[PDB]
Amino acid sequence: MAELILNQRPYPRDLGKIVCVGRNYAAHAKELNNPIPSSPILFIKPASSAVPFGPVFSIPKDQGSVHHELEIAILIGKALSRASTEQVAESIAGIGLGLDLTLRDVQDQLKEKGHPWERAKSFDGACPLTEFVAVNLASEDEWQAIGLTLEKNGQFQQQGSSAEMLFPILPLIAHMSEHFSLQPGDVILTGTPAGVGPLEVGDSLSAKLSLEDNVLLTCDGVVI
Template sequence: MGRNYAAHAAELDNPVPEEPLLFIKPATAAVPMAEPIRLPRGRGGCHFEGELALLIGDPLSGANPADIPGAIAGLGLALDLTLRELQGQLKKQGHPWEKAKGFDGACPLSPFVKLDWQPDWDNLTYSLWLNGELRQRGKTGHMLTPILDLVAYISSHFTLLPGDVVLTGTPAGVGELLSGDRLVLQLEDDWLRVETQVA
């Protein structure tokens, strides 16, 4: 999901979409977040975007928001790595973003917290620190399209299958990654904490 937080759209001088803005990363983009992040060489600056990730556990097609909670198997965190200059060029040309967001390793994923209870979907908080500095704090209550509505919307356009991962958008505070940078991502206060480093 792109531009699901108004403040992030504003920081990149992007308009707020009137409906959810979707793009897809291939399976080869997904890598364990605990492994070192390897930035593409010679392709411009690579930005981090911390996001709440949903692990789909049951098929969803044309679902209603009420159908969604039971189909989410786990909660995790993700980095939507983005080649920002390339993305800007693609946007100017009216082209899709996948070359800027779907490269190998472009989606580091944390482990997933198994959902054997129903969280308050509109009151979840996650954070990202870069080299010890808090850079992003996302609150699901600030999303333009709430989680359950977002997953239902996606399922109205294409079927979600078990093992699919939905990234729900990034809050403000994104920035460029450099070799040696250390990142810490945390879900709530104690549900999940993961550390990674740029190679």
């Protein structure tokens, strides 16, 4: 599986699990004709689904539509269990980006039957993940200033700010830790903004992570 990268070198703890939120951005719930949540939808992707974020993304081939979903990724550095938001902020080792790659037709069918989502979310290559970068934020306020951008084939595809999250980063993770204890090496996917859509072989993607409109990292890849 591993490792994760933090500050351009290997993170000392192997990738554990990838805890994900559904529908953290209102416009993304609307674009798919889903009801905006009042509590978060929670699922988990396994270490076996992680791959480097580019230069190539391999997608499943004969299983219907495969969707890109860019999301702010959070690396957990210290164990969290039933944690406060202060404990969460002190635990975060860095921030990066992930693609929550989703077999969308498979998900539609799973959902309709009330079935678990793993077939659509946990497949090999389901979680391209960038390197993480340590940020020592000036106030808890600044967690609301994190941005993401996806471009596909040179053109705008997705953009979001953590300001827009229904469940902001710190309280989301604090709440997550109430349901599943979090260990060092765990990753959090904080939700995809509007603009999700299918991927085809040969699509090129360009992903950008920012802080108050300053670029933290950029990562590119082509679909194969």
